[PDB]
Structures are given as C-alpha cells and as structure tokens.
Amino acid sequence: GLFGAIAGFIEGGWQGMVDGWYGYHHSNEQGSGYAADKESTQKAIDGVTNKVNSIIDKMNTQFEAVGREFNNLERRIENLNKKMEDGFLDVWTYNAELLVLMENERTLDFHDSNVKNLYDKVRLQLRDNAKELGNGCFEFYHKCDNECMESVRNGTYDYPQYSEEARLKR
C-alpha cells in the first residue's frame, strides 16, 4: 500500500477474522483464535459511511436534461441546445467518475493507514518487553494470560508491572 502495512509488512488477510475490520490474534496456553478491535473498526465505519453520503449529496445539484423541439429553420439553436446538454452531461459524468476514482484511492490508503496505526499503538506500549518479528506479529519476553492481552487491547497495558521477567529474559 501507501503506508507499507496492508500488502506490506502484513502479507495477507485473516479469513478467520470476521469479527471486524482491523483486529488482533491472541495465542497463549489457554487458547488461539482471533478477536477484532472496536475503537479502530468502528471509527473506520463512520469515516467510510460519512464519505459515501458526502459524495452522493454533493451530486444531487447535478444538471438535468430537458426536451425542447425546433423547426427546420432553427437548425443553429437546436444544435446549440444539443451541444449544451451533452456538454453538461459530459461534465457531470466526468465529475462523478473522477470523484469515485479519487476517493477509492483514499479509502484504500485510509484502511492501510489505520492498520499501520494499530501496529504502532501496540508496539509503542510493548517497548523492550517483547519481540518484534516484523510480519505483524509479536512474541513475549514474558507470560500473558487471556485477559492480559485484553490490557494491550483496551489500551491499558501496565508497564510498571511486567518489567522484571522481561529484562531478565535476555
């Protein structure tokens, strides 16, 4: 991608993850499996939903054709009429396609940016208390319960706690 994470340092996607958009995977003695993020997925839902409405709404003041007839001695103005209606049809066809092309790119990079942002809310809390494989996975210099992972999810990872067996693992 543009933020290096999707189709980058995190090679593929998790089929087993249908809990959300951007999630975690915990793997401790107690149990494997996936769990999604909420304050990450939901925030992406709003942003994508709002964007869609914005595009559509921005588009309802668009030109609307009208039929007008002309006699055979009004050939210049009839031609003027034809060119001015196609003229606006082409402008709005241009605008809609182009706003779709451009927002598609942004929507994709938004996702990518939000995954890379996630990988960095965990990493910048784990410090030297854990391994960084670099594939979008983390190994520990310590032991982690099922509800210990829930500390790094919730955002409340306790640093003035696990430092002992981390430093001494080296």
Partner: protein, 320 residues
C-alpha cells in the same frame, strides 16, 4: 506467547478502479449505478400518461377525425408521442409556432375542451360544407372537429364579425386557421369575394392574415393549404375575429385547468399497466441508487443520469 496485528479478508470478487490501479479486488463494495429498467411505460404515482398512439399533438388539438379517441382526455401525468405519427394534419398546411406550443403543453396536466363559438351561430354562412377527402372519417369526407371551415351561403360571403369573452378564471388556448386555395376560381367558388382577409385581435394580439392563392404540390391529394394559428386568451379578455373569406373558425378551445410537472416523451414503448415514481422513454426505474444510465430525459423522482458503464464505490479494503 504470540499476539498478531492483522486485517479482514474474504472470498469476494467485486472490483473497483483507482487512478493508479484498475480492478483492485476489494473486501466491501457499493455499486451506486442503476443499469436496468422494466421496459414498460407506466403510471406516474397513480396518474396514467396520455398515450397519443398514432396521433400527434396537432392532430389531437385540432381534432383530426382519426383521433376521435382523444376528443375528451382525462388529466395525464405526462404525454407520449411517436417519432412519426401518421395522423397530424389530414389537410396539408402549417401549424404556426408549433414548438412554442409544445413547450407550453409540457407545463400542463389537463385541459377542459370548451365551446367558444357555437357552430349554430353562423346564419349567413354555410358551416358544414366544410369537409375534404384529405380528412376522411369512415370513407366519407370530414374535417378537423374543433374548427369550422366556413363556406359561402348562396353566392355571398358577408363580413363575419364574431367575438368571445373569457368569462373563466383559467387561460384559454384558442386555435383558428386560414385556407390558401390553388387558383382564383376555387377562391370565388368557395368564398365569393376575390380579395379577402382575417383580422384577429385580443388585448395583446393584433393579426391580419391574407390568403396566398398559388400552385403547389398535392400533399394528401391536395394542393390547397391550411395554416393554423393560436393564442392564449387571458381571463376577462376577449378575442375578435373579422373575415370576408377563407376563415377556418374556432368551434372549441381548451381551458387550462391544471398546471405542473409534465413532459412530452418520444417513445414507441408499450404502456404496461404498472406504476412508477420514475419514468424514462425506454422504461421505468425502481431503484434506491443515486445514479443511473438508462436515458437523460426522465420524469418523476429519479437518480441522476451519467454516461458511465460501471460505477462502484470501494468501502472495504484490498482483498487477498
């Protein structure tokens, strides 16, 4: 002990385009373009259109005898007319300011056909002689029903003076005509007086019409011509006609009793006993989409028209 950071994926094949990359397969997409229609003409919110069939707007308003189906028309949501209706003017000629009239029409949902000059009020003139083979009704000769082709009564055509005051609250569409003969013999045989005119006045209209006696091609088997003319007679205004020959007089006019959203659709597509909120010359649209590509000329509440073949919004992320 191993925790990973990753993203959703699925067995989806829906593709989007972007500036750098086309057909980027995605996780979630929203198509925003309506591409289909029911292929019938339909009622527009419960109001049936007026399907003119083989008649044109002129044929209707003048009452070409082949258009009897339309002698009385209910209120319509929109009008449908063929590309080349076979019944227009049975008798050849010009319909003055025809397109400006259709434009007026297009902002109109209903007329009441009222009588403004009574066919029984011509005592000094012949009012039923008065027909042509160009406008046949069941083999015998006839004429446009809304107007009266006056003829001389016993070798004389005295000066017509006739007027009509609009005692209604609605505007009136008034139509009348002039006959242009082929030679001066038929001119005298029809109207006695050799040099003639039609003056027409209102509070804004001031017209004099003179017959053009000349040799032309037969059209519909006739070389004579009839030119038709119209005005909008306002409430409390009067219209005054003066003529000493060649006058194709009004019998009936149209009261404009309902105005609002209409249009004149060009189409050959059969009416199909359905109901729609959005209608196109190709067929009706039932959709929640904001864009379609069926036809630019629609009526009702419709998606906005584009020329695109595909238009899909990426909502999800790149698939794998």
């Amino acid at each position: 002990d191993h925790i990973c950071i990753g993203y959703h994926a699925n067995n989806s094949t829906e593709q989007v385009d972007t500036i750098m990359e086309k057909n980027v397969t995605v996780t979630h997409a929203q198509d925003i373009l309506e591409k289909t229609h029911n292929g019938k003409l339909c009622d527009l919110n419960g109001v049936k259109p007026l399907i003119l069939k083989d008649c044109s707007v002129a044929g209707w308003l003048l009452g070409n005898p082949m258009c009897d189906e339309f002698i009385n028309v209910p209120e319509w949501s929109y009008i449908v007319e063929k590309a080349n209706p076979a019944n227009d003017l049975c008798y050849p000629g010009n319909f003055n300011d025809y397109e400006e009239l259709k434009h007026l029409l297009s902002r109109i949902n209903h007329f009441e056909k009222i009588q403004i000059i009574p066919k029984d009020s011509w005592s000094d003139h012949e009012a039923s002689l008065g027909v042509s083979s160009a406008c046949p009704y069941q083999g015998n000769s006839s004429f446009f029903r809304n107007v009266v082709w006056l003829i001389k009564k016993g070798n004389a055509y005295p000066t017509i003076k006739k007027s009509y005051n609009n005692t209604n609250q609605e505007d009136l569409l008034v139509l009348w005509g002039i006959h242009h003969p082929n030679d001066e013999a038929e001119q005298t045989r029809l109207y006695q007086n050799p040099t003639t005119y039609i003056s027409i006045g209102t509070s804004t209209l001031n017209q004099r019409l003179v017959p053009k006696i000349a040799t032309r091609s037969k059209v519909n088997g006739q070389s004579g011509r009839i030119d038709f003319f119209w005005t909008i007679l306002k409430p409390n205004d009067a219209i005054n006609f003066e003529s000493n020959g060649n006058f194709i007089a009004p019998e009936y006019a149209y009261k404009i009793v309902k105005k609002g959203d209409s249009t004149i659709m060009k189409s050959e597509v059969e009416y199909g006993n359905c109901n729609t909120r959005c209608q196109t010359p190709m067929g009706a649209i039932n959709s929640s989409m904001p864009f379609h590509n069926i036809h630019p000329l629609t009526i009702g509440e419709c998606p906005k028209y584009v020329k695109s073949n595909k238009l899909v919004l990426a909502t999800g992320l790149r698939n794998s």
